[PDB]
Design an enzyme around this catalytic site. Sequence first.
Site, PDB file in Angstrom:
ATOM      1  N   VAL A  70      -2.299   4.012  -3.516  1.00  0.00           N
ATOM      2  CA  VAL A  70      -2.026   3.026  -4.568  1.00  0.00           C
ATOM      3  C   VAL A  70      -1.867   1.677  -3.897  1.00  0.00           C
ATOM      4  O   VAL A  70      -1.020   1.518  -3.020  1.00  0.00           O
ATOM      5  CB  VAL A  70      -0.799   3.404  -5.399  1.00  0.00           C
ATOM      6  CG1 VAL A  70      -0.590   2.387  -6.557  1.00  0.00           C
ATOM      7  CG2 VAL A  70      -0.960   4.796  -5.971  1.00  0.00           C
ATOM      8  N   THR A 122       0.850  -1.195   0.000  1.00  0.00           N
ATOM      9  CA  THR A 122       0.000   0.000   0.000  1.00  0.00           C
ATOM     10  C   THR A 122       0.881   1.239   0.000  1.00  0.00           C
ATOM     11  O   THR A 122       1.791   1.326   0.813  1.00  0.00           O
ATOM     12  CB  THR A 122      -0.939  -0.001   1.195  1.00  0.00           C
ATOM     13  OG1 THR A 122      -1.837  -1.109   1.083  1.00  0.00           O
ATOM     14  CG2 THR A 122      -1.770   1.267   1.207  1.00  0.00           C
ATOM     15  N   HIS A 123       0.645   2.163  -0.953  1.00  0.00           N
ATOM     16  CA  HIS A 123       1.392   3.421  -1.048  1.00  0.00           C
ATOM     17  C   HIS A 123       0.420   4.553  -0.734  1.00  0.00           C
ATOM     18  O   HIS A 123      -0.549   4.758  -1.459  1.00  0.00           O
ATOM     19  CB  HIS A 123       2.015   3.629  -2.424  1.00  0.00           C
ATOM     20  CG  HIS A 123       2.830   2.498  -2.915  1.00  0.00           C
ATOM     21  ND1 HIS A 123       4.064   2.215  -2.387  1.00  0.00           N
ATOM     22  CD2 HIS A 123       2.633   1.606  -3.920  1.00  0.00           C
ATOM     23  CE1 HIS A 123       4.597   1.190  -3.034  1.00  0.00           C
ATOM     24  NE2 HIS A 123       3.748   0.793  -3.969  1.00  0.00           N
ATOM     25  N   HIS A 124       0.663   5.286   0.356  1.00  0.00           N
ATOM     26  CA  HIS A 124      -0.251   6.315   0.853  1.00  0.00           C
ATOM     27  C   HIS A 124       0.421   7.650   0.572  1.00  0.00           C
ATOM     28  O   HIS A 124       1.439   7.960   1.179  1.00  0.00           O
ATOM     29  CB  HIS A 124      -0.496   6.122   2.357  1.00  0.00           C
ATOM     30  CG  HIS A 124      -1.313   7.205   2.988  1.00  0.00           C
ATOM     31  ND1 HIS A 124      -2.607   7.498   2.607  1.00  0.00           N
ATOM     32  CD2 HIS A 124      -1.027   8.043   4.027  1.00  0.00           C
ATOM     33  CE1 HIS A 124      -3.068   8.498   3.350  1.00  0.00           C
ATOM     34  NE2 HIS A 124      -2.129   8.837   4.228  1.00  0.00           N
TER      35      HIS A 124
END
Lengths: 148, 148
Positions: free
Chosen positions: A96, A79-81
């Site tokens: 993402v 998870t890309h925050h």
Amino acid sequence: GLVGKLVTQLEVNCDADIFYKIVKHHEPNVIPHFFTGVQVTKGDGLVSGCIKEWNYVLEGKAMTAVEETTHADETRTLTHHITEGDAMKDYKKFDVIVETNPKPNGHGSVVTYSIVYEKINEDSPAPFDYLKFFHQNIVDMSAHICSS
Amino acid sequence: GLVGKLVTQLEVNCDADIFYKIVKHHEPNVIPHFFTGVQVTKGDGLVSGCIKEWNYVLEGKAMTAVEETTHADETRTLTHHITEGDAMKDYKKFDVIVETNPKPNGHGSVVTYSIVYEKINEDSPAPFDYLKFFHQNIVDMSAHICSS
Ligand SMILES: COc1ccc2c(c1OC)C(=O)O[C@@H]2[C@H]1c2c(cc3c(c2OC)OCO3)CCN1C
Ligand SMILES: COc1ccc2c(c1OC)C(=O)O[C@@H]2[C@H]1c2c(cc3c(c2OC)OCO3)CCN1C
């Protein structure tokens, strides 16, 4: 319509757990980019993620973003925050999510990149430029991997 | 990576069943396009779908496609099966699935456009141009609908 999700999903001929470990530890040198930042630990001193300030060029334009990355090995999910940067001029929320799963089939894998977004206002674009960039990046990565 | 799926999903403030019926019977006059074709009946004489030859302009370029449309009221799903045309120069398979569901929330809806594709070869693009077109079309449609 302010809240939405864009997805690209690709089949890959690779075991899901193996492919997840490759994605987890690998990010396209022809595209101009670099990052600075830090790693994040969980409390036992082992790295659990990272916080990165990226400098990159998207469709010719230089941009910055601050991203915190976490992972879930049990579900093979990254998870890309994104908390800051050019994308936040268009989006209140920008995340993402990258998932890798075995084909119901059995042998290969399905990789899903999802961009979960909330626009600042109705005039904001949906992040098709990011979807295509992430797509081409995972196609590029997968083209450097072969059986055995 | 030859088989894949692109998705755009949008939240709409409209009952799912109502919105599905609107999508089912409504397709952006500023974009140049027309179709010819036939309707398809199920055996009781009621129309169950249609087969259309479209002429349209996508990102400036005139194109044609032959599409068969079916629907599933029980699941609020529309399926567009493209059998011929410019898109078939890039894709062995090209299907567009439109689903409308109530938010787990309860009141509004989530609309999902999925493009399920198989490329002819590795040099074929993924259909990001179609995804953006379908997205903008459903955003345009939804912007002409309001409560009550
Ligand atoms: C070649 O240069 C790049 C390096 C790395 C990334 C991108 C990129 O080139 C646009 C990118 O797009 O994906 C990743 C980066 C990244 C993500 C999300 C981002 C972002 C990112 O870094 C630029 O900035 C805006 O939101 C999610 C994944 N993570 C690893
Ligand atoms: C304004 O002009 C257009 C009218 C209608 C459509 C499009 C279009 O403008 C590119 C389009 O894109 O969506 C639909 C059409 C359609 C679909 C799928 C297609 C296609 C279509 O018609 C051109 O051709 C390639 O695959 C699925 C939905 N159906 C209703």
